[PDB]
Amino acid sequence: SGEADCGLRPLFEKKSLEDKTERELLESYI
Amino acid sequence: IVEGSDAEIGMSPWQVMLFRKSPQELLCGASLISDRWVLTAAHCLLYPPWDKNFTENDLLVRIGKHSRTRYERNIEKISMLEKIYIHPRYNWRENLDRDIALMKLKKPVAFSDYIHPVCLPDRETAASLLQAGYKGRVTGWGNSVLQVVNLPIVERPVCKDSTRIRITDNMFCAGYKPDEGKRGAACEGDSGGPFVMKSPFNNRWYQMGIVSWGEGCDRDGKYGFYTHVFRLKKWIQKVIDQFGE
Ligand SMILES: *[C@@H]1O[C@H](CO[C@@H]2O[C@H](CO)[C@@H](O)[C@H](O)[C@H]2NC(C)=O)[C@@H](O)[C@H](O)[C@H]1NC(C)=O
C-alpha cells in the first residue's frame, strides 16, 4: 500500500537531489 | 502560511487538499499516508457549534496539486471518500485534544513524481526528533502556489505560557520567538496539514504533527499548535488495521 517506500520523494531523495531549504532542517539538529 | 517561500515541484508530494463539493470550497489541508489513507485534523470534519459534521459524500480530496486555482492536467488527481474516521476521544468541547481524523479513499491513488506518501513516526523518530529547537516543515497556502516554512519546535513550558489553552501530551507547539524577529509562520488556515521532519537516520520524511490551531499570523498570538501524531498512533493503527485494503 506504499508504506515500505514512504517519505522518499521521486524528484528529490530518489534522484539524489536536495530541496532548497532542507539543509535548514538538518542544521537545526546541530 | 505567512512569510514562506514557494514550494518546489514535487517537494511535498504527500500534500492533500480537502474540499467541500457544493458549494465548491477548500476546507483544510491533509496528508497522504498510504495509497488509500489521508490524515487531517478532526476539527476540519466535525465541529457541531459551527454546524460542521461532514458525511463522506459531502467531500473530496485533490492530490498532487501545487496551484491553488489552476487545473493541473495529468498531474493532479481527485479522490472520493469511502469513510471518515474521527478519533473517539476528540475533545471539541474544551481544547481540541486528539484533533485527528482519517479519511479512507474510495480507490487507491496512483503514485507519481507529484504524489507519494509520507511516513508515520516510529518510537525512535518520536523520541529523537521531537525536541525543542529542532525544525520541521509546514506546507499550505499563503495568507497562488503551495508555500513552505520551516519552524522550530518550542519548549513545552514556553508553549503552555503562550496560550490560555490547556496543552496536553497529545499536542506540541512550534514557531519562531516573536521578539527574535526571524520570519515565517503557520496559521489557522493551515489546519489539517502536515508538520514533517526529515530523519537524519534514514533520510526519510516523517509526519510528526498536524496543524491543529494557529495563534499568530492574523492574530496577536505567538505559536502554532500541532496534534502529536505519534501519541495517537495506536488509534491510527487500529483504524488502518481493521479497514485498510
Ligand atoms: C454527526 O453526524 C453523525 C452521523 O454522521 C456519520 O458518522 C460517521 C461515524 O462517526 C462518520 O464517519 C460520517 O462522516 C457520518 N456520515 C455517514 C456515515 O454517512 C451523527 O450520528 C451525529 O449525531 C452528528 N454529531 C456528532 C457530534 O457526531
Side-chain angles (χ1 to χ4, degrees), chain B residues 173-189:
Chain B
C173 99
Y176 289 107
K177 246 195 150 169
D179 62 285
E180 179 195 17
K182 184 159 177 180
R183 305 294 280 155
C187 311
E188 180 68 17

Side-chain angles (χ1 to χ4, degrees), chain B residues 42-43 45-54 90-93 96:
Chain B
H43 85 261
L45 296 167
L46 176 67
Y47 194 65
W50 295 352
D51 295 338
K52 211 174 276 295
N53 189 3
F54 294 115
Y90 161 57
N91 196 352
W92 62 263
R93 290 179 196 264
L96 304 182

Side-chain angles (χ1 to χ4, degrees), chain B residues 46 48 52-57 83-86 92-93:
Chain B
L46 176 67
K52 211 174 276 295
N53 189 3
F54 294 115
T55 196
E56 292 80 21
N57 289 151
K83 195 70 167 131
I84 289 163
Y85 305 87
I86 310 278
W92 62 263
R93 290 179 196 264

Side-chain angles (χ1 to χ4, degrees), chain B residues 215-227:
Chain B
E215 303 199 346
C217 307
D218 63 343
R219 301 282 186 279
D220 287 338
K222 297 191 183 195
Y223 303 117
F225 292 83
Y226 297 81
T227 303

Side-chain angles (χ1 to χ4, degrees), chain A residues 5-6 13 20 22 28-29, chain B residues 8 116 119 198 204-205:
Chain A
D5 201 41
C6 66
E13 287 79 18
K20 280 289 266 277
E22 64 174 89
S28 79
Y29 303 150
Chain B
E8 289 161 73
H116 196 92
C119 302
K198 186 179 177 161
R204 293 185 187 244
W205 295 86

Side-chain angles (χ1 to χ4, degrees), chain B residues 5-16:
Chain B
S5 63
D6 294 350
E8 289 161 73
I9 289 137
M11 203 192 77
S12 188
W14 35 79
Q15 200 72 206
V16 177

Side-chain angles (χ1 to χ4, degrees), chain B residues 140-166:
Chain B
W141 309 95
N143 280 247
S144 76
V145 295
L146 190 68
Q147 298 294 291
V148 60
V149 67
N150 297 318
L151 306 168
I153 296 165
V154 176
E155 295 202 333
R156 293 195 70 83
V158 172
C159 287
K160 296 173 185 170
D161 275 352
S162 302
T163 181
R164 73 174 178 272
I165 304 298
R166 190 178 60 90

